[PDB]
Every structure is written in structure tokens, then in C-alpha cells.
Design an enzyme around this catalytic site. Sequence first.
Site, PDB file in Angstrom:
ATOM      1  N   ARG A   1      55.441  30.556  59.353  1.00 21.05           N
ATOM      2  CA  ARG A   1      55.964  30.266  60.700  1.00 21.05           C
ATOM      3  C   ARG A   1      57.270  31.007  60.938  1.00 21.05           C
ATOM      4  O   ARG A   1      58.262  30.788  60.212  1.00 21.05           O
ATOM      5  CB  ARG A   1      56.161  28.755  60.899  1.00 21.05           C
ATOM      6  CG  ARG A   1      56.550  28.327  62.298  1.00 21.05           C
ATOM      7  CD  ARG A   1      56.615  26.813  62.372  1.00 21.05           C
ATOM      8  NE  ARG A   1      57.142  26.346  63.645  1.00 21.05           N
ATOM      9  CZ  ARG A   1      58.428  26.262  63.970  1.00 21.05           C
ATOM     10  NH1 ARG A   1      59.380  26.608  63.111  1.00 21.05           N
ATOM     11  NH2 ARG A   1      58.768  25.814  65.184  1.00 21.05           N
TER      12      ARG A   1
ATOM     13  N   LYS B   1      66.552  29.879  59.125  1.00 23.17           N
ATOM     14  CA  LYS B   1      67.085  28.551  58.817  1.00 23.17           C
ATOM     15  C   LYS B   1      68.352  28.584  57.968  1.00 23.17           C
ATOM     16  O   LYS B   1      68.716  29.605  57.390  1.00 23.17           O
ATOM     17  CB  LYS B   1      66.009  27.686  58.127  1.00 23.17           C
ATOM     18  CG  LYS B   1      64.953  27.203  59.097  1.00 23.17           C
ATOM     19  CD  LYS B   1      63.983  26.238  58.426  1.00 23.17           C
ATOM     20  CE  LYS B   1      62.935  25.745  59.415  1.00 23.17           C
ATOM     21  NZ  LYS B   1      62.028  24.774  58.758  1.00 23.17           N
TER      22      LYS B   1
END
Lengths: 273, 264
Positions: A246, A212
Site C-alpha cells: 500500500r 510513515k
Amino acid sequence: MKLFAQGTSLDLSHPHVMGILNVTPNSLIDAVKHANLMINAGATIIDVGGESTRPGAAEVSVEEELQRVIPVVEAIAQRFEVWISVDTSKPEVIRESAKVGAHIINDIRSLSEPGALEAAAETGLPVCLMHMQGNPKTMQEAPKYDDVFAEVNRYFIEQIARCEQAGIAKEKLLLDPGFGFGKNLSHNYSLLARLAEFHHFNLPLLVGMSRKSMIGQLLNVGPSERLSGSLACAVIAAMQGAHIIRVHDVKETVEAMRVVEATLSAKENKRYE
Amino acid sequence: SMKLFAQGTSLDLSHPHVMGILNVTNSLIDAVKHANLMINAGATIIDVGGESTRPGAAEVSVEEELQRVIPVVEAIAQRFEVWISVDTSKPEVIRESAKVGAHIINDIRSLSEPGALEAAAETGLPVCLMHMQPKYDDVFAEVNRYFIEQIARCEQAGIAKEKLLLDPGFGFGKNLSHNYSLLARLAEFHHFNLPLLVGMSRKSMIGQLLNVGPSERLSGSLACAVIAAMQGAHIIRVHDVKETVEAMRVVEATLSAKENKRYE
Ligand SMILES: CNC(=O)CSc1nc2c(=O)[nH]c(N)nc2[nH]1
Ligand SMILES: CNC(=O)CSc1nc2c(=O)[nH]c(N)nc2[nH]1
């Protein structure tokens, strides 16, 4: 600490790696192959997602999401023993997924869509509640908090209450601070630094930082150059007792989590703060 | 606020530093090229030794060790601003290394060879105190006790406490559970108020846990580095500098967002 679904359980006494299975655009064959590589790499949960939740994303129709997601959930539930989380906001996808074997509803909108709360409750499945400021179309324009930890924490208070009142027992719930979802760089690191403080709810914590912007913007690198940063994020979170991580890169994360587990089991209180 | 001073420069230990491992095996050109690559990957210290200075490697004469070590240290000191750690146990090498620009004496034997203690004291340079001897009642307490004694031994030889660094010596007479117990309790070694240096990169504490060979231990090495740095470890000794530096920037962003600046 355990979750229960589809007649099995998930033991959250150690961290679990959740592999990302993106089915935004033979797609069934490839998805099952990718799921299989991730299972072999040690993923114990596969997160199947048919709607892009990225900044700016257009919504996907119910019919498109169903077609992308349900055959994938079904195929995996038929072939493997792994748990399956469905990354959806839609009542019908929630319902149909449960019917073909999904174990966790992982909704980035925390069941805010009309009917989502009631659908999730009818399935009896575990439910992950994620923090997001705004919605995916405008969350990243100008994220703002007086106190990001307190505001995310208040949010979990209210959503846990909202869920209990629809008849979803606290024991089915998971919490996720929603890294990247209406947060600038410094907001994201404030949340990661204080992640252990969310244990007061006594609920499983789920985190997704893999590849991210909180890594990209810090290192100034593109999505393909973020593995080392992602592992660091994963380790920092799992050192603070995060239960599910995740990720895109399952093998590397699982190896890192084994090191974390060996460290935590040598510790006399089982967590860093 | 923690700082080291050497060769007219200083090392700011308010954040973690990645120390790259340099193999000494012409060979001088190659060493400098490898130093260059690690510096460009973001190492702020280079540890001169590697394969030739590992435990079990062939011992060498004073003369050989000076010929292989001194030109490398000199070459780096002339060309780069990076700090230079020297892997040696020999007083002559300690002395000559200091003369050509070395910043840290990194002796895995904690200055135990004859004359090594007096040579290190004369240099005025920072010294790393690493634990080495596997059986313990309380591995942390044994290592801790060892630091108390070596701190005193050094202070008594005229080496100020402010020049000392402490390393628990992962993999050095330690089985798997001993290593992980030390790593789990690393933050407790902060009561000495000294820099902590750690070296876990590609060690058997990772290889045996994951059951992989030496070239497949990057992910585990990174985890170990992050776990140490989150506990306030100041120097991380590694083979894979770029990846470690990246993990360290994540740790720094995290610790800067914390009010306390360390995990325990
Ligand atoms: C490259 N970015 C992505 O993978 C965005 S999609 C996504 N992120 C998350 C997350 O952080 N938590 C949970 N629970 N579900 C998520 N779904
Ligand atoms: C693959 N094994 C190695 O790199 C063993 S050599 C070595 N280890 C260490 C260490 O842990 N600390 C310090 N200070 N110096 C060291 N030199």
C-alpha cells in the site's frame, strides 16, 4: 494464491501495488483523476479511505463517510477494471461499497465495530485483518509489547478464528501487521524484519509503510522527504513474499517491484528469510 | 567485525557503506565540489573514475591518466576523511595513487595488465576483485570459480586475503537473467568470508527490465541496492548517494532488529 470478488480474480503469484486514495477533506472529479494516474502508473488495486486513521483523529459520521466514499468507489468501478479496496470500519459503508463494486474490505479495526463482522460476511468479499494496539485516538501514546511479533501473531490467530466463526472462509482473508498502529520505531522494524514468518498462516500479506513515521523518525525528515525510505521498506517486504504493498508513490513502487520479481523468479525457492 | 585498513585509517564493515561515483573529466575544483556533495549526502567512500573509466571509454596514456587521476585523489585525501577508491588498471597509477592517499584499488580488469598485480601488492592497499568476461552454464558457479582463482592469484603475489574485496561485476558480460541470478544468490558469496562490493546503479539490468533511459533508473537502482544490502553486501557503488544512504539506513534498522543480521 488468488482472491475472488465481483466476478474477477486477483493473481497473487507476484506482488501488487495498492495506490492510496484518501478522500478525507470538486472532490469526485479529482479522486477519479488521481485514481487514473495511479492505474496508469501500474497500481492494480486502489484503496479508497474516507476516515482519517491518524494518531489523535476524530471519528467521522456514517453519513459523511458514505458521501465521501461511495460515489468514489462507484465512479472507479464504472470506469476502470482495477480492483478497489475500501478502507472502512462501518457496516453501512461496507454494505454500500460492495453494492457499487468494491472488491476488498480493508478494515484497520479488523471488523471490531458492532455489526461490521456480519456486514463483511454478507458481502462475501475478501477481508484484510490488520493489527492495531488500542484505537487511533490513543494507540501512539505509549505502545508497549513484551514480544511484538508474538503478540501480533497471536492476534491474527484469534481474528482468523473470529472471522471463520462468522462464516467468513479463511480463503477470503488477508493479514497486515499494521505498521505505525500502536508501535514505536523499534516495534515496527522488529515486525518488518520477521515479516516472512507470518507466511505460516498461508494467507496473503498486505503491508503499508509508505511515508510513515518508521521512515520519518529514522531519517529525521518530514512526510515529503520519505520516498527513498518508503521504497526500501517496500522492497524489504516484497523480498519476504508480501503480496500487496500500500503506497502513495505508485510508479516508483511498481518499478521497484519489477526488480524484486526479476530477483525472486531467478531464485530457486522464491523468497528471502 | 569485518574491517579494512589503509592509509592509517579503517573501514568498519559491520554495516553497509555507500560509495559515490566521481566522474573525472578547473576540473579539479569541480571534482572536489562533487566529492563534497556526496560526502555531505553520506558517502563514506568515493570512487574516482566515472565516465572516463567506463567500459568502451577512450583509453588514455599512462601520462594522461596520472595527470587526471593523481591530483583528484590528492585533493580529496587532503580535504576529507572519506575513503578513496581508484579506478585504474595501470601499475604506475596504482603506485602514484597509493602515494597520495588512495585507500582501495578498484580495477575492473582484476590486475590483469602487465605489472598491475605486483604494483597492487607493493601498495599494501585493499584490492577489489571484479568478475568480467554473454554465455554461462551456471553463472554463479563461473563467477564463484573466478573468485577462487583470483584469490589464489593474489595470495600468491603476497596480497593477504584480508585485503581482498569481491565484486560479481553486474553488467560485465552478463545478460538480464545472468545479472538477476547473481543478485538472487548474492548471499552465497559470503562463504569466502570477504567483503562484497556491488555496482548496479543505473545499469542496463534496470533499464532493460523497466524499459527506461539512464536518468529514469533511480527507483530500480534503489531496489537493487536494498536487495544486495539485505543479503549482507558491504559496499554499494552508486550515482545517487543521498537516496541510497537513506535506503541503507532502513536496511540497517531492519538488520539490527533481526537475530541473524542477513537475508538468504
Ligand atoms: C500515512 N499513513 C497512512 O496511510 C495511514 S492509513 C492506513 N494505513 C494502513 C496500513 O498500514 N495497512 C492497511 N491495511 N490499511 C492502512 N490504512
Ligand atoms: C553505468 N555503468 C557503470 O557504472 C560501469 S563502470 C563500473 N562498474 C563497476 C562495478 O559494478 N563494480 C566496480 N567495482 N567498479 C565498477 N565500475
